[PDB]
Structure 1
Amino acid sequence: MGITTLDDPLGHMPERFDAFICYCPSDIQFVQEMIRQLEQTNYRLKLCVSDRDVLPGTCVWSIASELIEKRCRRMVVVVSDDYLQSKECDFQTKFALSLSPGAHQKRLIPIKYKAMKKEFPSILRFITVCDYTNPCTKSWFWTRLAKALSLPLEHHHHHH
């Protein structure tokens, strides 16, 4: 685990990780639901998380913080009141800072299960958020997130 070799639950993927999930412990139940409800209805994914000691099964494993860019294409940013104030947001921010002023933004997808009052950090400030709290987009929501993930950042191949 961590950075140790011989670790490859998925048979060592040259594909690497698609996205890294960072979320708040206070709204963990929604995230636990998300990861499994993705795989049950999606175009096949393979992700990882910051804290994996919890979660229901979830096919993920531990990687290096200094290698998040080298391991995962994207980061799933769970924007909750507890997230914006907890270490999790700072972690995601440090990653985004090592990427690039603009490119990082396309590499961070903000997910919102609830509706808070807190203000946004400029490092993400909602580029393209998917509100699970709104039944309008909560229909093929997991498949929509899965679509946005399965698409490599924004590699313009599928038409445009």
Structure 2
Amino acid sequence: DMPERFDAFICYCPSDIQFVQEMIRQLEQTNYRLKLCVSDRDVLPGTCVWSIASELIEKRCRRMVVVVSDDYLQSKECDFQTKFALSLSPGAHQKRLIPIKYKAMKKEFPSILRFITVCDYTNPCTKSWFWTRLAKALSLP
């Protein structure tokens, strides 16, 4: 049934839901069998993701995937993600946050995501086994 522990929480704003659906579906098709959660799984019919209470995320989720876009930068989710990131010990950010950009942006990354490496889905050179390498990163202890 519902995991007590998850490989990742996926943080995203509603405007980006189509990418999240693609992402979860592709991750689910790798061999990695990740436990993924979101705030509300009801808006992601067809996937295996779980809903989780926001106050449990830091305790129960090894990492947080952050879907970054222009719309995200203006959302309520980005505010929550920023508070979450700031709660982490310096040096913990690179390990526990995985930002992912899927399309062009007119805006710069938020202060706390600028320094960490980004997963750039738009980059032609990432095109090799993209979802498998992401799954691998998420499975790591």
Normalising by structure 2, we get a TM-score of 0.89
User: How much has 1:138 moved relative to structure 2?
Assistant: 2.1
RMSD: 1.7
User: How much has 1:15 moved relative to structure 2?
Assistant: 6.5
Q: From the CA coordinates, give the structure whose radius of gyration is larger.
A: 1
Q: Is the CA contact 2:39–2:53 (under 8 Å) kept in the aligned structure 1?
A: no
User: How much has 1:29 moved relative to structure 2?
Assistant: 0.8
Q: Deviations for 1:108-147, whole angstroms, at most 9, x for unmatched residues?
A: 0011111101122222115121111123212301101101
Distance 1:14 1:83, change over 3 A: closer
SS of aligned partner of 1:124 = helix
User: How much has 1:71 moved relative to structure 2?
Assistant: 0.9
User: How much has 1:60 moved relative to structure 2?
Assistant: 2.1
Q: Distance in 2 between matches of 1:109 and 1:81?
A: 17
Q: Is the CA contact 2:94–2:117 (under 8 Å) kept in the aligned structure 1?
A: no
User: How much has 1:40 moved relative to structure 2?
Assistant: 0.6
Runs of 4+ in 1 over 3 A off after TM superposition: none
User: How much has 1:14 moved relative to structure 2?
Assistant: 6.8
Q: Deviations for 1:80-130, whole angstroms, at most 9, x for unmatched residues?
A: 111111011111111112222321332100111111011222221151211
Q: Where do residues 88-103 of structure 1 align in structure 2 (5 Å cutoff)?
A: 88-103=77-92
SS of aligned partner of 2:112 = coil
Q: Distance in 1 between matches of 2:55 and 2:130?
A: 31
1:4 alignment counterpart = none
Q: Where do residues 70-149 of structure 1 align in structure 2 (5 Å cutoff)?
A: 70-125=59-114, 127-149=116-138
**2:31 aligns with one of 10, 32, 42:** 42
Q: How many residue pairs end up in the alignment?
A: 140
Q: Is the CA contact 1:68–1:95 (under 8 Å) kept in the aligned structure 2?
A: no
User: How much has 1:63 moved relative to structure 2?
Assistant: 1.9
Q: Where in structure 1 are there 5+ consecutive unaligned residues?
A: 1-12, 153-160
Distance 1:77 1:48, change over 3 A: same
Normalising by structure 1, we get a TM-score of 0.80
SS of aligned partner of 1:93 = helix
